[PDB]
Amino acid sequence: PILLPGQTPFIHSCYMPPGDQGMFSILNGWRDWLISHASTTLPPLRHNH
Amino acid sequence: VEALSTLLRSVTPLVLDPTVLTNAITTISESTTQTISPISEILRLLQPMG
Amino acid sequence: SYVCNVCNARFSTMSALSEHLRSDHRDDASTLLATPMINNAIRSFLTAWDGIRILSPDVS
Amino acid sequence: SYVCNVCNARFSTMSALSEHLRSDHRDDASTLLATPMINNAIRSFLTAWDGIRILSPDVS
Amino acid sequence: DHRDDASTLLATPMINNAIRSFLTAWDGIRILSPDVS
Amino acid sequence: AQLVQIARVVHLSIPSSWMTLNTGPYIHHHAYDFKPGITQPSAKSRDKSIWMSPILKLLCTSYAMTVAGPVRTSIVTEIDGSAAALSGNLRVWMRDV
Ligand SMILES: [Zn+2]
Ligand SMILES: [Zn+2]
């Protein structure tokens, strides 16, 4: 991806692996922003994850 | 007391580096199959407010 | 301003909220005392013996 | 508009935000920011590069 | 807050598999009922 | 068995784009699955490390290769669940398929 919401463009290298690995790596970097942002924007879910 | 303490800290060649102790400790080999590792505990004791 | 969802405190920056979420409503430190294969047994034991709970010094 | 999720300042363009991140938060370690860390890594990269030629210079 | 966060396999499957198979194999040896007897 | 040989058991493979790079030594001794001074003890793989560590290393190097810029050392810092729980679920899935 070129730019994710909350990030800065052009931070992902072309050597990013396809498939689940690419997904995991992206989410791993994107983790904290997603968690914090979700808390502000949405009500909490009903039981722990 | 605060006044003197700050004055002391202001002018002193001494430097406190917490890393040196952790490095000296963490590098000790141990078996991973024991249920209690003393290394983790002693780290957990002095880590707070580091 | 940015807010929590558990204690619902408010923060002036998103970064401050993130670290709070990583520190307050996280797991306790006592969980790290032992292996999970024991901690589950410990939890079962305490739950089992909850009937021995000491009464408050008001009903007595 | 865009917000610097650390200092909570607002910016009209991603360019202005990026320049602010590179300039202001040059040494921060907040996980919400990536670019200062990479730039820091690049600085380490250069220091290693010095270690190379310092014991292997170039002759005419 | 928690519902099932403590749930895993909680015993060695190899032992249980060996046990389970053994009991099933010798299940034919079991006793007769007094009615049948 | 080699790192990739065992890691492929869960379809963790090397991207074709990497085939022109000398990734071997990095995966071998640069992707710390358990650095003593950094990792939380909850993530200690213990005896199953014989087949757990390659998986973690593959995940680590994949993330490191993802970001732009120079290659950096990759370190597992924490598993939300215990490493034992992770291994148990993996064994279940391995048995399922
Ligand atoms: Zn809160
Ligand atoms: Zn800022």
Task: Give the Cα separation of F62 and F74 in Å (integer).
Answer: 9
CA distance A31 to A35: 6
Cα–Cα distance for residue pair D26/B9, rounded to 1 Å: 27
Pick the residue from chain C with its C-alpha nearest to F85. C36
Residue of chain D minimizing CA distance to C12: D8
CB of F68 within 8 Å of a chain E CB? The answer is no
Q: Distance (Å, rounded) from C-alpha F82 to C-alpha F56?
A: 14
Which tokens in the block code for residue E16? 């249980």
Residue A39 burial (CB count, 10 A): 22
Q: How many angstroms separate the Cα of B37 from the Cα of each of C35, D57, F77?
A: 11, 49, 18
Cα–Cα distance measured from residue F57 to residue F73, given in angstroms and rounded to the nearest whole number: 11
Q: What count of other Cβ atoms lies within 10 Å of the Cβ of residue D36? A: 19
| Cβ–Cβ < 8 Å for F85, A35 | no
C29 touches chain F (CB under 8 A): no
Using alpha carbons, list the distances in angstroms from residue F11 to B48, C41, D17, F27, F90. Answer: 41, 35, 40, 17, 13
Centre of ligand 1 from the C-alpha of residue F80, in Å: 19
Closest-CA distance of chain A to residue D55, Å:
32
CB neighbours (10 Å) of residue F90? 16
Which residues have a Cβ under 8 Å from the Cβ of C53 and sit 6 or more positions away?
Answer: none
Instruction: Tell me the CA distances in angstroms from F81 to B35, C31, C34, F41, F44, one per residue in order.
Output: 17, 11, 14, 11, 11
How many whole angstroms from C11 Cα to the centroid of ligand 2?
15
Strands F74-75 and F31-32: parallel
Place of tokens 């391995």: F94
8 Å CB contact between F55 and F8: no
For chain C, say whether B44 makes contact (Cβ under 8 Å): yes
Other Cβ atoms less than 10 A from the Cβ of D19: the count is 12
Q: Which residues of A touch D5 (CB under 8 A)?
A: 6, 33
Are the C-beta atoms of F11 and F58 separated by less than 8 Å?
no
Assess contact for B38 and B45: CB atoms under 8 A. Answer: no
Quote the tokens at residue F39. Answer: 């990792």
Ligand nearest to the CA of C10: 1
Packed helices F83-96 and C36-48: angle between N→C axes, nearest 10 degrees: 100
Task: Give me the total of CB pairs closer than 8 Å, taking one residue from chain B and one from chain F.
Answer: 15
| A48 vs E contacts (CB less than 8 Å) | 1-3, 5
- What is the nearest CA distance from C60 to chain E, expressed in angstroms? 32
Chain A residue at shortest CA distance from E4: A48
Any idea of the CA torsion for C5, C9, C14, C18, to the nearest 10 degrees? -60
Q: How many residues does chain C have?
A: 60
Experimental determination technique = cryo-EM
CA atoms within 13 A on the CB side of F89: 8
Q: What are residue F67's phi and psi, to 5 degrees?
A: -70, 155
Chain B residues with CB under 8 Å of C29 CB are 44
d(C-alpha F48, C-alpha E27), whole Å: 35
> φ and ψ at D39, to 5 degrees?
-60, -40
Chains B and D touching, counted as 3 or more CB pairs less than 8 Å apart: no
Comparing C-alpha atoms, which of F94, F96, F85 is closest to residue F8? F94
Which of left, alpha, beta for A14 (phi over 0: left; psi -120 to 50: alpha)? alpha
